[PDB]
Every structure is written in C-alpha cells, then in structure tokens.
Write a protein that binds this DNA or RNA. Structure first.
Ligand SMILES: Nc1nc2c(ncn2[C@H]2C[C@H](O)[C@@H](COP(=O)(O)NP(=O)(O)OP(=O)(O)O)O2)c(=O)[nH]1
Ligand SMILES: [Mg+2]
Ligand SMILES: [Mg+2]
Ligand code: NA
Ligand code: NA
Length: 325
DNA sequence: CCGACTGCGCATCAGC
DNA sequence: GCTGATGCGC
DNA sequence: GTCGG
C-alpha cells in the first residue's frame, strides 16, 4: 500500500524503535515497535484512530494512545523531545557505524565523541570492525541493485568452483527470493567432505581465493565456519561501492535446512515452523526432527534438498520467489 | 501478574 | 596463560 | 511494548 496512507505513523514507530534499541537498550521494546510498524505498514486503510489500530496484532494500549496524539497533533511530544536531545541523538547516530552498538555508542558520547569526525579523530579507540564500519559508513548504507548482485554471484560461484569443483555455494537472502535490490550478500557454502559427524581450511581456502582476485577487500570477522567482511566489483569508470558479504560453511547434512533458513523471509520462516509443529515436526536452522508422542524430539531426518523439508510437512514446494510470507 | 520475545559465531572484555 | 561473559551482527 | 499462560 501507499506510504502516504499511514507513513507518518510507521515513521513515528520506527523512530521510537531505534531509540529503544540504541539509547534505552531495550531490545524487546525495539522489536515491539517494529512489529507494530510492520503490521500497520501492511494495513490497507488510512487509520482514523488509535482504537482502529489496536485491532491489529502487535498494537497495544500505549501505541494506540500514541497514534491518537499523532493524528490529533501531527507529532509526538516525547519523540520531538528526544530528537532534540544532543546526547540521545548522538548515541542513536553512532550506532549506524557497523561494529558500534548501543554500549560502544554510549561510551563514546560519554567521553565527548559524538560524530564521524570525532571517530575519525580517535582511531586508536576503535576496534578492527569499527574502523572498517567507519571507513565504509556511506557504502554500507547503500542498497545493492540486483544486476550488481548477479555480477557478484558470478565471481563467487566461479572462484569457489576454481578452488574445488566439489564445493557447493548458494547465494541466499533476499536475492534468492528474487528481490530487485539487496542490503548485503549471504553465501552458504558446503563440501561433501564436511558433515556433522565429520579439513577446517575449507572456508579459509575460499576466502583466500576471493581475496587473491581482489573481490574480498576487508575482513570483519573470520573463524572456521563463518566469514564476515567487505567485497567490491572490479572497476575507467567510477568504482563500485564496497559491500557487505557473509560466507557460512555448513555441514552437508545440514546444508539445505541452512539454505531454507537463510533464504527467508523471517515472516515466511515463522509460518513454516508453526505449520511444521502442527504436523509433528520441529524445524530450526540446522535440522528437521519428529516430535514423539509427548514432545521428545527424535533423530534429525535426512535432508538432501529443500523440497525434502516441504515433503516431510506435507507442503508443496514454494519457490523462493513466493516466500515473503 | 509476569515471563517470553532465536540463539549462535566471532572478537574482545572481565576475571581467575 | 585459560575460561566464561559480554558486545555485536544477523 | 505486546501478548498470553
Ligand atoms: N529466529 C530468528 N531468526 C531470524 C530473526 N530475524 C532474522 N532471522 C534469520 C532469518 C533470515 O533469513 C536471516 C537474515 O538474513 P539477511 O540477509 O540479514 N536478511 P535478507 O537477506 O532477507 O534481506 P537483505 O536484503 O536486507 O539482506 O536470519 C529472528 O528474530 N528470529
Ligand atoms: Mg541479506
Ligand atoms: Mg545478511
Ligand atoms: Na492489538
Ligand atoms: Na552499529
């Protein structure tokens, strides 16, 4: 639906959400406001009253009350005030730097460090992640057009196969759902030699090759199963924005549960789990399991493709395209 | 009334 | 030194 | 902040 429907309300709720997460450090209030924001964003009518909004799941007494104030006045007194607050708005802003959370942001603002400029001045007080986040502050907040994501996929699948043709790599996330743009790139990686009961250079070798051809440019974090970092498409034209890329190495017997999980959406993943229990199965990130007569979970069932998971719960395979809910 | 709201990998801190 | 807790991102 | 046991 059009933003001009309830965009004022959803903007208000999103703004309240961020201050809860970043300033009050109340993560559950943060998700509460966002849940309320989401369901109102989907609501196909211009809301006339807080009581009207309250019918929706996720909208309670306090938000219905806040909406009443917004509709009547065009603003929120509390929001106006906190917007104004130099301390709170600075803390809120610094968290936009990847690696700087609520705790670091507060500590920085505590000692007078409030801006990117201030961060740029105080490099030795930033850890490795926070420096990278600072270095690519602008780039990290850009979205990635699908065409560039396709070019990025080309390089990943090529270099991965070059390392070992028996690797299996799948670019999941919104891109796999066929979105016209993405926030980052999520690559899931496996190899027949790696199972749950199973070299742990399997991830390193792929990262290394992607670094060698200068696709991967920076490393945020890297262990034996998970890589988080920065990549960039090759350039006399203007150079591309640096992009966030994650690579996960998953055991083969857990790969397609992994692919399903990290393809999303979260809203879709929720239903699929809920319907999975109603059929007597439990689905998490790693496995699908039967729930015995009292709720005792048996051994993880063998999964060799996505559809296998759909078959167990008697679902017909839904294409990633049709997985926004 | 009052507990749940995903929980894990990695980097780094806190403490022994 | 090591172990467990915390911060962070997702 | 919201929901529900
Ligand atoms: N249990 C649980 N799992 C979650 C939750 N939130 C997310 N997940 C899981 C399920 C999600 O699929 C995954 C996050 O993948 P991203 O790449 O960060 N999001 P995407 O790629 O779709 O969009 P973008 O284009 O912006 O990158 O984490 C949660 O609250 N609870
Ligand atoms: Mg993504
Ligand atoms: Mg991601
Ligand atoms: Na409600
Ligand atoms: Na941040």
């Amino acid at each position: 639906p059009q933003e001009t429907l309830n965009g004022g309300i959803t903007d208000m709720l999103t703004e309240l959400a961020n201050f809860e997460k970043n300033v009050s450090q109340a993560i559950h209030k943060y998700n509460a406001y966002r849940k309320a924001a989401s369901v109102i964003a989907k609501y196909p009518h211009k809301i006339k009253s807080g009581a009207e909004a309250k019918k929706l799941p996720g909208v309670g007494t306090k938000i219905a009350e806040k909406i009443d104030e917004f509709l009547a006045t065009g603003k929120l007194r509390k929001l106006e005030k906190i917007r104004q607050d130099d301390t709170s708005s600075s803390i809120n802003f610094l968290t936009r730097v990847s690696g700087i959370g609520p705790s670091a942001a507060r500590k920085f603002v505590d000692e007078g460090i409030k801006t990117l400029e201030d961060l740029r001045k105080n490099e030795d007080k930033l850890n490795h992640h926070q420096r990278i986040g600072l270095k690519y502050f602008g780039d990290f907040e850009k979205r990635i057009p699908r065409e560039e994501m396709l070019q990025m996929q080309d390089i990943v699948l090529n270099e991965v196969k070059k390392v070992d043709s028996e690797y299996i790599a799948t670019v999941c996330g919104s891109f796999r759902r066929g979105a016209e743009s993405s926030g980052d790139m999520d690559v899931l990686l496996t190899h027949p030699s790696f199972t749950s009961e199973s070299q742990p250079k399997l991830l390193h070798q792929v990262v290394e090759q992607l670094q060698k051809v200068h696709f991967i440019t920076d490393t945020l974090s890297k262990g034996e199963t998970k890589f988080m970092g920065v990549c960039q498409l090759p350039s006399d034209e203007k150079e591309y924005p640096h992009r966030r890329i994650d690579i996960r190495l998953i055991p083969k017997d857990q790969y397609y549960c992994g692919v399903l999980y990290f393809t999303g959406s979260d809203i879709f993943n929720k239903n699929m789990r809920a319907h999975a229990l109603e059929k007597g199965f439990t689905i998490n990130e790693y496995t699908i399991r039967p729930l015995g007569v009292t709720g005792v979970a048996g051994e993880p069932l063998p999964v060799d493709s996505e559809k296998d998971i759909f078959d167990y719960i008697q679902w017909k395979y839904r294409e990633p395209k049709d997985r926004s809910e």
